[PDB]
Amino acid sequence: TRIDLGERPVVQRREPVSLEEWTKNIDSEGRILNVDNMKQMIFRGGLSHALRKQAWKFLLGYFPWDSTKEERTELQKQKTDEYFRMKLQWKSVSEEQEKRNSRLRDYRSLIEKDVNRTDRTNKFYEGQDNPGLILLHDILMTYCMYDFDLGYVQGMSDLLSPVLYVMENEVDAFWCFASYMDQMHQNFEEQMQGMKTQLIQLSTLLRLLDSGFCSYLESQDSGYLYFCFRWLLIRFKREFSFLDILRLWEVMWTELPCKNFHLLLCCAILESEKQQIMEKHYGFNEILKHINELSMKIDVEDVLCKAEAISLQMVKCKELPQAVCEILGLQ
Template sequence: MASCQTSGSDANADVLMCLVMESDGYKLAFEKHGVFLHTSTKRQHDQDSMIQGVIRIIEKSSDVILQWIPVDEDEDAAQIHYRKESPGSTDCRTEEELFDPGYEPDWAVISTVGTKGRPQEETPKAPKSGHRGKWAFIISLSDLKSIRKSKPGLGWSYLIFITKDGVSYQALHFHQGGTKALLKALRKYIILANSPKDSRLYLVYPHDSHALSHSFDELQMFDDGSSDLFSRFFGDPYTATFGGFSKVTNFFRGALRPQDGVYQRPLSEMAVGLEDEPGFEVITCQVELGERPIVHRQEPVGEQEWESYFDLEGRVIEVEGLKRRIFSGGLSPGTRKEAWKFLLGYYPWNSTVEERKTIVREKTDEYFRMKLQWKSVTDDQEKRNTLLRGYRSLIERDVSRTDRNNKFYEGNDNPGLGLLNDVLMTYCMYNFDLGYVQGMSDLLSPVLFVTQNEVDSFWCFSGFMELVHHNFEESQESMKKQLAQLNLLLRVLDPALCDFLDSKDSGNLSCCFRWLLIWFKREFSFQDILLLWEVLWTGLPSLNFHLLIGCGILDLEREALMNSDYGLNEILKHINELTMKMSVEDILCRAEALHQQLAHCQDLPLNVKELLGLAEFKSPAPSTDTASPLQPLSPSQVHELDLTDSVSPSQPDSSIEILPTEDTTTSQSLSP
């Protein structure tokens, strides 16, 4: 394939045109659009400085080649879909392996590569003739010596391909992602081993039995003599066997060292003014953070202090001050039942006692009207309502295993389980678009535990769902966005940890998926979750403080992760085993300290400032005298969510109220 590596637009066009004409023995094994070649390291915006193209792996009868050619129009990029999967289901499995992010098998993360609205091509496109055509290239995988990847940063990832002849091709920038997918596809044909001298360099070896045999000979696994080998084996078979094979692992990680000097592509093939490729590394984040402050938590807000924040008519005075106290200390058990109704938008902060009584009456009637809608459905009707039947089945299954180690929900005839079921079924009537998705029962359980009331728990839960409903949407765009934001924060706070996770194929932080999905419900004890959630509901110090909670957990486990030889599976296992082993007070202190450290940084990137609400030009926070449950709601939603609370003046159904038999503070912790 050396003849394919010619320079000049006409030569490359001819070579690729010949490839198009070859129909026998041709197979398109991989294709990725949105792969750009930057002809200048300057931040220019003219089209010629960034050439859009497509990269392909093509199987031929006698060879496998890597091809990049420029294209004129954007194509659809590969998508990552997070879907809910029933246990044992294989319908949605594709050629891509199902990736388990570390939570229950019911929540599967499925990676699929698809294209929308583009007919499947039978042959690869030939490059356009002209000045852009000279950048096209074809490399035989047998001629490939190494692949250099970009330094993890805040910009586009890129790959540089280097041949055995010393030719270093111009970097390909993956604006829409896809470097890992390409490397995974390449591993079907070649071995990619990390260089022992450069963590960003992959060394290329062929899948060849002769080469493997020769590698064993070079390693001299049995260089101590056969008699000594047998004596060592019988004395310690484990050490002797795995000690030898560890050399094989080390070899494939890069025993063959790259040459110190690698030739760059000839200047005649480069654009005028093109700088050395390492210049692109300016996109990485190197922020000088100051010293991290020490943060201490305050005492929780007690009943007497809570009452001091109300005027004679029952309005809350100094709302922001009260929120700051809740953020810094949380709430005592005696104040939670009332305070949560304000925090979750059931009670407007500026409402009087009489106004709240009216809200309770109206919202109680509204709740039971919605409940009657599904209660009055006959069995015959339900047989023809697949959606309702599916919701009922899923809710019954989830309720039966939600917080069953907590005394409030233990036992088969516990009324709390019935209320969990009824509230979730009624929510399906309240929010037809979303319905019920697994994980919602985890969010409702603590709310019902605190309010001890069916109507109150429903409207508080509805306010909570206004904050997190995007987490449960089928597209999972919100979850992907939050994982990317978590990665952004962690890369600023701890680049070394990010580099480590990247090297272990854990840089996407999918191990943190469950944390964000249900707001750490499975990570802390039941009582700790009550404190954590009320702190997060204040919206202080920023709406994305839950991301800093995640950073705080990773910061706590930093040494355990980096001082180990963990791989991807071990990292997932370690993260999962943190369940119920962490102190929420410690994590809250760490997260607040991280926020203060970032807030005092003068060089903080603008996107990080926006994420943390530190950008000066951002819109002001909603007025504190609205009924908004939290800042994420739009003004129209604020008025819709004049959600009421029931301090239970008069209830139409005695089953609504649950009187605890013992102090709620003595309830057992949630099991993982």
């Protein structure tokens, strides 16, 4: 016996924010007028392709919302200088230095490995002669100079590639990736807490939604949800088309409707596959295969709707447990 969530609302989404709608909210000083409203619009509709390059800078934290234009143009000047200063640090490393730096050449081999593996049918990264791959490589090496303790960990190029695609500039892509890595950091740490914390948080959400399904997974030894690992590490990057991911991440970065919205996206997908898994009586292996084969077969708009529908239903609940309250950011 547990919580009655009540009925699930139906969610309606809106058209993406146009370049024109954006420019209207900018004053003469280049400040943004209604932030909360713009965030609501970006969450509700996403961003038009033309608006994507400027607005992501604000979404990712590269440009502060309260900034003016002169503060931004001043910021880019410092960030350009700060970037190439760090790029020079690894680029001036000699063969002799590499022999004696084990951590550095380890990072480099991991980078070269993932880069060749990243988005190779995309126009930006296609072909072995593509400048885009060099940019991927360079930005990732420079991030090793920026954060040497973390360096490069597998899956970080999957996070960078859409950011590099949108920004197209080496300096801009780095600092956007840099702020993106700040929130994504504990995913790639040595003993990784925050992958474990997210899996714990995720199961907590599911036990509230359908506890029968959770009891099922425990019987199938799927109780710790390792099949959700790929989802959480790279934020669904492998489950969606490149264009779909752009829209998916735009919406997430608004930080609306609640905290850890990406966990509810997991719930959204998981409730759609809930019946097939239980009927066909899938075990841990069949579940992992079923979810991996679910790639590219998921509609973004449908999932964003269900995920928000769920959050609305949880926040409204007076009997909602405190553990979930913390996860959704109500505390």
